Amino acid sequence: RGEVVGESAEKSESTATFAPVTSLVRKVQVTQRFSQEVKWADESRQLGVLQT
Amino acid sequence: ANIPLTLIEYGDPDGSGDLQRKNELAIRAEVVYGVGILSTDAFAVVRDA
Amino acid sequence: ANIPLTLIEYGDPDGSGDLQRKNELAIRAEVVYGVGILSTDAFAVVRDA
Predict the structure, then answer these.
(1) B24 vs A: CB within 8 A
(2) Do the Cβ atoms of C26 and B17 come closer than 8 Å?
(3) Which domain of life is it from (chains B, C) (predicted)?
(4) What are the counts of helices (DSSP H) followed by strands (DSSP E) for chain A?
(5) Which residues of B fall within a CB distance of 8 Å from A7?
(6) Which of B3, B13, C6, C48 suits B37 as a labelling partner, its CA being 20 to 30 A distant?
(7) What count of other Cβ atoms lies within 10 Å of the Cβ of residue B12?
């Protein structure tokens, strides 16, 4: 901030203050489980279940 | 030695307070003389006391 | 970091009064060292306590 001062009046200081802020780190996973029966059914009959 | 007329902008050269704190300036000039008298008998004075 | 030998003419850099008031000069040098000991066991001392 600025300060208003007289002719030989004593001057002050006012200085910028700073602080840090920090990230977190999040790991996200998805796991889908199915029978090998479902792989056989899809690859024979062309369902597109594994692709969807 | 001789220090020709100069501007002082910082500190307190005379005791009144800091030049930057009070927003003041000072000018200084300074010389050093050597002085000696070979005989005082080389002089005479007129006076009234 | 390193501040090589340099002349100070103004203010009071040491607490003993102002350099322009008391008509003095000061020379200063600085260095900053980082220091660390990876294990104290890497060293031994010969002593006479």
Answers:
(1) yes
(2) no
(3) Viruses
(4) 1, 0
(5) 23
(6) B3
(7) 23
Torsion angles phi and psi, residue A36, rounded to 5: -65, -20
Query: Between chain A and chain B, how many beta carbons pairs sit less than 8 Å apart?
Result: 14
How far A22 CA sits from the closest chain B CA (Å)? Answer: 39
Resolution of this entry, Å: 2.7
DSSP A46: T
Strand residue runs (E) in C1-49:
2-8, 26-31
Q: How far apart are CA A47 and CA C2, in angstroms?
A: 73
Report B:7-26 residues touching C (Cβ under 8 A): 8-15
Residues C31 and C2: beta-carbon distance below 8 Å: yes
d(CA A36, CA A24): 39
Structure determined by: cryo-EM
Contacts of C13 in chain B (CB under 8 A): none
Flag whether B touches C (3+ CB pairs, 8 A cutoff).
yes
Q: How far is CA C30 from the centre of its chain?
A: 5
